[PDB]
Design a protein around this motif. Structure first.
Motif, PDB file in Angstrom:
ATOM      1  N   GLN A  37       9.282  35.056  67.171  1.00  0.00           N
ATOM      2  CA  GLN A  37      10.584  34.286  67.780  1.00  0.00           C
ATOM      3  C   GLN A  37      11.693  35.413  66.893  1.00  0.00           C
ATOM      4  O   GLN A  37      11.264  36.075  65.811  1.00  0.00           O
ATOM      5  N   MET A  43      17.147  28.205  66.415  1.00  0.00           N
ATOM      6  CA  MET A  43      17.316  27.873  67.676  1.00  0.00           C
ATOM      7  C   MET A  43      16.870  25.939  67.373  1.00  0.00           C
ATOM      8  O   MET A  43      16.297  25.782  66.675  1.00  0.00           O
ATOM      9  N   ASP A 220      17.241  25.692  73.363  1.00  0.00           N
ATOM     10  CA  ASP A 220      17.145  26.938  72.973  1.00  0.00           C
ATOM     11  C   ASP A 220      15.531  27.090  73.832  1.00  0.00           C
ATOM     12  O   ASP A 220      14.704  26.188  73.207  1.00  0.00           O
ATOM     13  N   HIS A 227      15.273  35.110  73.170  1.00  0.00           N
ATOM     14  CA  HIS A 227      14.808  33.997  71.744  1.00  0.00           C
ATOM     15  C   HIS A 227      13.504  34.776  70.930  1.00  0.00           C
ATOM     16  O   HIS A 227      13.178  33.806  70.638  1.00  0.00           O
TER      17      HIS A 227
END
Lengths: 630, 100, 124, 196, 290, 108, 69, 57, 49, 115
Positions: A37, A43, A220, A227
């Motif tokens: 990530q 997120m 997200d 991301h």
């Protein structure tokens, strides 16, 4: 290191020796790059597994992956409960822990209950949804924990419960143990002595949680390449090493404790008692690092922020040069995803344009899980300095975050590397994001590096949470495009690229939409996917199969073969350069490693022996040395 | 299009390897994610990522069991002995050498 | 000060206690002290509306301005694909492609007849 | 593989009539009348509303995929036997497809005419949060090409936008084999042990 | 089908042939008479004005759609809403409130009810726990209105989220084991209705729309329980044929009859599994299988 | 339209505080003001007491190096103003009543 | 490696034409098309044998284990 | 294999004696069947075949 | 059925586990066997046989 | 307090005559970046809405007006030096922000898209 191709030949290496790998017992091994990530960005994510963590857990949550400036990572998850309660999850030495979030908010800095309420509700007082969740969270704390009225009494409590697990010593008081909890776990990228900033980001993460459960914000996607980032092989090698040296300091303490549990003889000021201890502490850390590189098994008493414990290192094969160079452009999603029956992670997505090759992925089980970078994609290694960027944003219309208190998706929160530094409108926030890209490619502005990505997220209806996220850290995928005013090169990351209109050719620039143009449309392909001749004329499953078959030809491993002791090598004897080649064949110097030969090919059915997968070789060509190899 | 093969340029570079920085610089920018990442462990700001990480794991304190035979207070119970605080403040990797 | 059902103290900033379950008729700040034996504050009417996603139905979908449901018989994937097939008398047949094999053997086409609807499939 | 000079003009004239197909399929789904332009702000509000729902996006995909497969099948009808440079008792790519030796008329049409709509598990090309299907395209671009309708053919090569969508359709078949490890080996063992 | 002999099919269906005199407009009205209708489906809004002071009064106001709308979408009259809201809904709502407190411990302007509304209201205060007011739009069927009172002792309660969970559970009209009945395209003249769910006992009572002698399911164990073992055996050869006919794969019926006659050889619906193997004579078949 | 700036004051006439929304602080009280001079910058400190409360403030490092504010004074008969330098104070309220702390172990 | 002695397709001796070819390119500054036609290669199968040869033996010979340095 | 995903096993080594010969006199080194093209649609190999012969000339 | 020390990955699987698995004794050695007078090879095409 | 040093107190403070009668003295709070020096300039072009652009030495500035909360603090006399100004909380009549802008240039399309 600093060594000419001439000198590399004289020291028994290839002239274009590439490096990038480890020699461990004579086998060349390297640390495989993984997708993790993106750091320092919360997120909003829905996961049905969040409801599996207990009853009255909604499937909503905010997740942040905070990295320390020594690249050690820390994931904090913020669960929403079906009672209006919010819990703060963390993981410490392979054990999950849960705490109420208003305990952290009341332990980070000195607060009133308006300041928590004011931060979550900046304006938008008259939203009945968000203001009734928020007293369930305040009066949930004041009912469950009634005797915690100031900052040095909630830290007393939190150090009481977390004393054994953090392995604190008895000279540490509880307003010191609980302060170690708040320096080692909650929002570690903002760093120690930055608790005012860890306060504002939690108030940002709670309203973004409430804006997710209201439907105002789309979740997200953690598979969507904007991301996520790349955990580099050398950065992982120092994460694992830090844990090993950390264990070494614990084994000394384990050795001295085995002497106060025998009462033998202890004077710590004695110089030779120290030498008496260190002879029995195991301090062959360099052989524990070799064990990681020889097997790939990750042994760690903490557990890193990673979701598997194996497969971290691979053998750099030398069956030809295309196989060898493509170990270094290779990135992997994670071995946790190889066992799933859902193909959403295996899917080619439009945010991978220019960052991951559409073609160069294998066929079979790792299809879509193992993929290679694009040709001109670059990964950040150092963090570009961002100390001057807050002074530049305050020069623009950014009100300072210390005295604004204006949360909400109706404004544009400005962040740099995940530190919230101010608030603007969405109109002014687009002028800030546009002029900073103007000041960036024109190198007359002193403080802006060129590889600063400017992630402006505009407002919408039920879209992504808006903001003005600036990133400058390590491990970012980056690629070059041309900014159309000034015609200069610009550096773009994948978080930016979702909202940027980037023309493929200059001929397809339309007025007043495209601000950028590609340098060449071949930047989006791989290295090995870019050498395939006329590959825009083939069916796309055949270009994916050439990237697979090209790694398995017998070509040239190298020309320094007499100083090698490999298990097996495949050398084609007389290679030829191709008549029909790409321009990038020469730029990567693939003529030093000839992979094949030019053949007079007839497309004819003549013999009857060539059907369904079969070809026919000329016999006299073979007797004259065609396709010979050892 | 025209895209020549550099047949005299190849044979000159085979016989005579360059005595300057290498030709084919895109080939060294293909492994810059690996080499530069390892180079940040020792070079760069704050002494590199190893020296910057030995100070996050700072102290490991244990005491002895021996008494002071101190004054009869709650300090007489609340004394723990001398304080060993072991730590690491510098790590370095030597470029490899061979021994006797 | 009052925000909906919530009320906060103007000295200490603390959240006051809700004046209903009090004993002896007093509310105050808990950090500092305020004085309210009367429980002065009025009825706090907090109107909350349900979300306009909470009841999905076939009738809510008809209250969408965009189309939410196709017609029954008005979609046939645009067929004039001339395949002389002996199925009924048909010349037309809808098609679709993938790549199911091990990236080496070619695309096998997903055929679909129209006139008789009788399923006829060919690989080569 | 070549179309004749007349037949190569036929596919030009038909594919000129698909520059407006993506918008007319859009204004049908969003129930807007009398041919609103593509840049109309009340159209772009509605197309964003379709984006946020999986049901509503499946309707916009399935309407537009019907109207471009109409344009696709007119080109194959107009050009494939009748507008090729070399014809059947000398044209081996047609002789192999018509005989059943190897190939189909779908393969011949994607070589000589156009690839057509790239369909991803019954739907159209996926689209980002910003309403874009690639960074090359405007957000909410009402265009057949923006949804992955490849008007290019393998004879003349395909453009980089429609090269990227064709790699999406090439991986959707390979990932289905990747979920196909062990399916029918134990079904047949259970039948054959009873019915032995 | 072949393995596991599942009596719990994932998607159990039922195919209902309609008569040759009944029309399409009569049949679409008939599908609405069967399908389950949640009370959630007819609700446009629920506006809750919580007020505290005096006991916490909760004023729950429901907006339905227009009465012609849900009657022409769900075949539901406004008098059916009254006997669901007053009788079924509020018992569930108070069962959820007391449960939630149990874990907490651990435009228009309207007036002037008549006599019958005043009598309906006092009928509901007796039957429930915390209600004290009730009304209904008896004239247009557009809104409902009831005004709970809990104690002053309890603190905040997410009333909107409780109402939404209760509304998505309350059925207005459900014949059991059946969710949905739809009217597909008539394929080869069989004008049929496909039903999401299996209950033959209830479709027998619908004989003025449905030819009950030809109603076909895909659930084998439902047909075995109701119509016997030869009807269950004709189901298995029709279900395995439909697995292959949707791929244009043709297997002969001589194969499918032998599989279906091996499964029904004991009068029941056995599988090709370990428990289906159990009642057999050879032990070395059994030892060598698993 | 234009406005003539008349006077600019270096010296601290007026400060500006930042509290929670609704903060009263009854007009009996007055807060002292402490100032840093590290030879080029200004970092102010607020502090003041009353009978029950005792509460302070400060300026922010990131803000004051880049963003100064000005308290203005406009009389529309003038078509001119006079200006004074205003610091911006991020201030808390600690209650004097609840500055309590317990023992650093369990004592068992 | 070294130049093939014969061509694969035709069978012309081609191995005597590699040093002649590099002098027609260096000294005479011919292009590759004229240089191949003065060497007498005129079938395109025999052309690509000299045209497209890599000559990696010059890169192998730098690694000599029988001489110092 | 060529550079287009057209792999193939060598099925027989066929003598030049009875392999087809051109106007130029050339026997080809590799024979590939044209029935490997219509289902693979690797048209980059057809254009490489005439590009490579133009470059050898 | 004999747990004993219970330390995981127990060796000496006993005379039942020799009989019960996919391998076992029945499936691997009675139902299927390895044979004498057999061969295997890659196949090649031929229009002339 | 008894805080460590550097923090020398403000003994003497200046005059700020905010009187508040009932023409009247409006209390403004305007922003500036720290780069612009306020005594160097003489005029401040103001607008009702957010449409200004002033130019001081190649740097274009702007009022992005956001008129429609932070506490004013006046000196008590000159020593205790805090009174929260009020009337019976004294809100500012106007709050402005001078922000640095830049000029993004138009794309020369005649040069950048060559056929």
């Amino acid at each position: 290191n600093k060594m000419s191709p001439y000198e590399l030949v004289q020291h028994k290496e290839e002239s274009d020796e590439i490096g990038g790998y480890f020699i461990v017992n004579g086998i060349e091994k390297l640390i495989r790059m993984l997708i993790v990530q993106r750091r320092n960005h919360p997120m909003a994510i829905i996961r049905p597994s969040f409801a599996n963590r207990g009853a009255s857990y909604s499937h909503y949550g905010i997740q942040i992956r905070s990295v320390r400036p020594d690249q050690t990572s820390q994931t904090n998850v913020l669960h929403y409960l079906n009672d209006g309660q919010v819990t703060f999850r963390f993981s410490w030495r392979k054990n999950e822990y849960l705490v109420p979030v208003v305990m952290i908010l009341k332990a980070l800095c000195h607060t009133s209950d308006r300041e928590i309420f004011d931060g979550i509700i900046g304006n938008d007082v008259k939203d009945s949804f968000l203001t009734d969740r928020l007293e369930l969270l305040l009066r949930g704390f004041k009912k469950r924990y009634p005797h915690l009225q100031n900052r040095t009494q909630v830290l007393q409590y939190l150090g009481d419960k977390f004393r054994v697990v953090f392995q604190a010593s008895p000279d540490q008081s509880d307003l010191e143990v609980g302060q170690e909890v708040l320096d080692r776990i909650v929002l570690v990228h903002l760093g120690k002595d930055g608790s005012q900033d860890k306060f504002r980001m939690l108030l940002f993460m709670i309203r973004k949680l409430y804006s997710l459960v209201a439907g105002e914000c789309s979740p997200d996607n953690p598979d969507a390449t904007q991301h996520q980032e790349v955990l580099l092989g050398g950065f992982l090698y120092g994460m694992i090493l830090k844990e090993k040296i950390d264990e070494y300091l614990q084994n000394i303490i384990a050795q001295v404790r085995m002497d106060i549990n025998r009462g033998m003889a202890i004077n710590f000021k004695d110089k030779r008692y120290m030498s008496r201890v260190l002879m029995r502490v195991n301090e062959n850390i360099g052989s524990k690092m070799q064990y990681f590189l020889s097997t790939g098994n990750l042994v760690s008493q903490s557990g890193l922020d990673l979701q598997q414990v194996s497969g971290y290192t691979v053998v750099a094969e030398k069956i030809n040069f295309y196989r060898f160079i493509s170990h270094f452009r290779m990135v992997h999603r994670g071995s946790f995803f190889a066992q799933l029956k859902t193909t959403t992670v295996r899917k080619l997505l439009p945010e991978s344009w220019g960052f991951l090759c559409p073609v160069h992925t294998p066929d079979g089980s790792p299809c879509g899980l193992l993929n290679h970078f694009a040709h001109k994609c670059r990964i950040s290694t150092q963090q570009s300095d961002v100390s001057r960027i807050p002074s530049i944003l305050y020069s623009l219309g950014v009100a300072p975050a210390s005295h604004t208190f204006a949360a909400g998706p109706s404004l544009c929160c400005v962040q740099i590397d995940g530190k919230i530094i101010g608030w603007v409108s969405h109109e002014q926030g687009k002028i800030i994001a546009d002029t900073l890209r103007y000041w960036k490619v024109e190198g007359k502005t002193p403080g802006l590096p060129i590889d600063l990505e400017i992630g402006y997220v505009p407002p919408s209806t039920r879209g992504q949470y808006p903001g003005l996220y600036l990133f400058g850290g390590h491990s970012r995928m980056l690629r070059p495009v041309r900014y159309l005013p000034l015609d200069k090169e610009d550096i773009v990351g994948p978080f930016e690229q979702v909202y940027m209109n980037i023309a493929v050719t200059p001929q397809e620039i339309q007025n007043n939409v495209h601000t950028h143009v590609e340098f060449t449309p071949t930047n989006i392909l791989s290295i090995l996917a870019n050498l395939t001749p006329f590959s825009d004329f083939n069916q796309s499953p055949r270009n994916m199969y050439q990237c697979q078959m090209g790694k398995q030809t017998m070509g040239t491993p190298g020309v320094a073969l007499c100083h090698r002791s490999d298990n097996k090598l495949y050398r084609l004897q007389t290679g030829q350069t191709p008549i029909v080649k790409a321009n990038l064949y020469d730029d990567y110097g693939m003529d030093n490693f000839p992979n094949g030969f030019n053949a007079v090919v007839a497309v004819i059915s003549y013999t009857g022996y060539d059907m369904d997968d079969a070809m026919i070789i000329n016999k006299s060509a073979d007797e004259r040395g065609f396709g010979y190899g050892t | 299009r025209t895209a020549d093969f550099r047949t005299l340029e190849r044979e000159s570079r085979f016989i005579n390897p360059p005595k300057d920085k290498s030709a084919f610089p895109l080939l060294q920018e293909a492994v810059q994610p690996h080499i530069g990442s390892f180079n940040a462990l020792t070079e760069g700001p704050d002494g590199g990522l190893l020296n910057l990480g030995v100070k996050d794991i700072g102290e490991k304190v244990i005491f002895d069991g021996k008494p002071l035979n101190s004054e009869d207070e709650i300090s007489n119970s609340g004394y723990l002995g001398n304080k060993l605080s072991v730590s690491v403040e510098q790590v370095s990797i030597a470029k490899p050498m061979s021994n006797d | 000060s009052v925000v909906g059902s919530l009320i906060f103290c103007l000295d200490c900033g603390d959240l006051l206690e809700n004046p209903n379950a009090v004993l002896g008729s007093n509310v105050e700040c808990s950090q500092c002290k305020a004085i309210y034996p009367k429980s002065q504050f009025s009825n706090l009417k907090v109107v909350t509306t349900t979300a306009d996603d909470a009841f999905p139905s076939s009738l809510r979908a008809k209250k969408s301005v965009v189309k939410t449901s196709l017609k029954k018989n008005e979609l046939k994937d645009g067929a004039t694909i001339k395949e002389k097939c002996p199925q009924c008398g048909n010349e037309e047949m809808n098609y679709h492609t993938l790549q199911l094999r091990s990236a080496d053997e070619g695309a096998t086409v997903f055929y679909t007849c129209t006139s008789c609807g009788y399923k006829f499939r060919t690989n080569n | 593989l070549r179309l004749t000079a007349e037949g190569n003009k036929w596919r030009t004239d038909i594919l000129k009539t698909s520059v407006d197909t993506g918008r007319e399929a859009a204004a049908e789904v969003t129930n807007l009348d009398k041919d609103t332009p593509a840049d109309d702000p009340e159209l772009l509000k509605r197309l964003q509303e379709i984006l946020r729902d999986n049901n509503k996006s499946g309707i916009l995909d399935a309407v537009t995929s019907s109207k471009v497969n109409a344009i696709t099948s007119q080109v194959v009808s107009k050009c494939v036997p009748d507008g090729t440079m070399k014809k059947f008792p000398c044209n081996s790519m047609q002789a192999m497809a018509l005989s059943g030796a190897k190939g189909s008329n779908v393969n011949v049409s994607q070589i000589m005419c156009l690839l057509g709509q790239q369909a991803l598990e019954g739907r159209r090309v996926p689209v980002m949060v910003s309403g874009k299907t690639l960074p090359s395209f405007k957000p909410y671009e009402t265009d057949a090409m923006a949804g992955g309708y490849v008007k290019g053919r393998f004879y003349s090569g395909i453009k980089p936008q429609e090269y990227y969508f064709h790699c999406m359709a090439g991986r959707e078949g390979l990932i289905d084999t990747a979920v196909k490890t062990s399916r029918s080996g134990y079904l047949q063992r259970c039948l054959t042990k009873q019915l032995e | 089908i072949v393995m596991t002999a599942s009596a719990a099919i994932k998607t159990p269906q039922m195919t209902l042939p309609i008569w040759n005199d009944v029309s399409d407009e009569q049949a679409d009205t008939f599908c609405k008479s069967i399908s389950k209708v949640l009370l959630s489906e007819v609700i446009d809004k629920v506006i809750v004005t919580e007020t505290t002071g005096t006991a916490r009064s909760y004023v729950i106001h429901m907006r339905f759609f227009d009465n012609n709308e849900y009657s022409e979408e769900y075949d539901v009259s406004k008098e059916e809403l009254q006997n669901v809201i007053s009788n079924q809904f509020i018992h569930l709502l108070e069962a959820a409130i007391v449960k939630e407190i149990k874990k907490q411990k651990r435009v228009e302007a309207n007036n002037n009810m008549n006599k019958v509304q005043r009598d309906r209201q006092s009928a509901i205060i007796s039957h429930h726990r915390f209600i004290t007011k009730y009304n209904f739009d008896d004239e247009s069927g557009k809104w409902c209105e009831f005004k709970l009172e809990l104690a002053a002792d309890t603190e905040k309660l997410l009333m909107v989220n409780i109402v939404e969970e209760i509304c998505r559970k309350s059925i207005i009209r459900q014949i059991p084991h059946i969710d949905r009945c739809v009217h597909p395209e008539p394929e080869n003249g069989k004008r049929v209705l496909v039903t999401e769910g299996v209950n033959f006992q209830a479709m027998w009572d619908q004989e003025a729309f449905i030819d009950v002698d030809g109603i076909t399911s895909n659930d084998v164990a439902a047909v075995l329980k109701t119509y016997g073992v030869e009807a269950a055996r004709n189901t298995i050869v029709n279900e395995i044929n439909n697995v292959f006919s949707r791929y244009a794969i043709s297997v002969s019926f001589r194969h499918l009859d032998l599989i279906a006659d091996m499964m029904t050889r004991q009068g029941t619906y056995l599988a090709f599994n370990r428990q289906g193997m159990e009642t057999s004579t050879s032990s070395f078949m059994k030892m060598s299988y698993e | 339209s234009e406005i003539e700036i008349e006077s600019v004051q270096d010296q601290p006439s007026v400060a500006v505080g930042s509290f929670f929304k609704g903060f009263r602080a009854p007009s009996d009280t007055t807060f002292d003001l402490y100032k840093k001079k590290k030879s080029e910058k200004d970092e102010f400190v607020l502090h003041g007491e009353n009978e029950r409360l005792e509460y302070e403030g400060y300026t922010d490092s990131s803000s004051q190096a880049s963003n100064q504010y000005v308290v203005g004074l406009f009389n529309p008969e003038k078509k001119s103003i006079q200006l004074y330098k205003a610091p911006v104070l991020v201030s808390k309220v600690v209650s004097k009543s609840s500055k309590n702390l317990r023992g650093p172990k369990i004592k068992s | 490696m070294i130049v093939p002695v014969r061509c694969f397709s035709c069978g012309k001796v081609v191995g005597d034409k590699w040093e002649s070819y590099l002098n027609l390119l260096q000294e005479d500054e011919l292009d590759e098309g004229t240089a191949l036609s003065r060497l007498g290669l005129k079938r395109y199968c025999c052309r690509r044998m000299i045209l497209t040869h890599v000559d990696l033996i010059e890169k192998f010979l730098r690694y000599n284990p029988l001489e110092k340095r | 294999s060529s550079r287009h995903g057209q792999k193939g096993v060598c099925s027989r080594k066929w003598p030049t004696i009875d392999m087809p010969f051109s106007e130029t006199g050339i026997q080809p080194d590799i024979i590939i069947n044209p029935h490997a093209f219509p289902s693979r649609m690797t048209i980059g190999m057809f254009v490489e075949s005439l590009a490579g012969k133009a470059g050898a000339l | 059925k004999a747990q004993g020390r219970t330390s995981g990955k127990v060796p000496i699987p006993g005379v039942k586990q020799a009989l019960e698995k996919k391998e076992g004794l029945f499936r691997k050695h009675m139902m299927g066997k390895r044979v004498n007078y057999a061969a295997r090879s890659v196949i090649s095409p031929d229009p002339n046989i | 307090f008894s805080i460590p040093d550097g923090f020398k107190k403000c003994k003497h403070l200046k005059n700020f005559p905010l009187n508040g009668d009932n023409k009247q003295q409006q209390v403004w709070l305007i922003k500036f970046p720290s780069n612009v020096d306020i005594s160097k300039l003489k005029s401040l072009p103001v607008d009702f809405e957010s449409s200004t652009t002033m130019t001081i030495d190649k740097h274009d500035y702007k009022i992005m007006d956001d008129t429609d909360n932070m506490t004013l603090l006046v000196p008590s006399e000159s020593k205790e030096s805090l009174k929260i100004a009020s009337t019976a909380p004294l809100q500012f009549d106007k709050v402005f922000s001078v922000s640095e802008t830049a000029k993004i240039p138009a794309i020369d399309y005649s040069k950048v898209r060559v056929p």
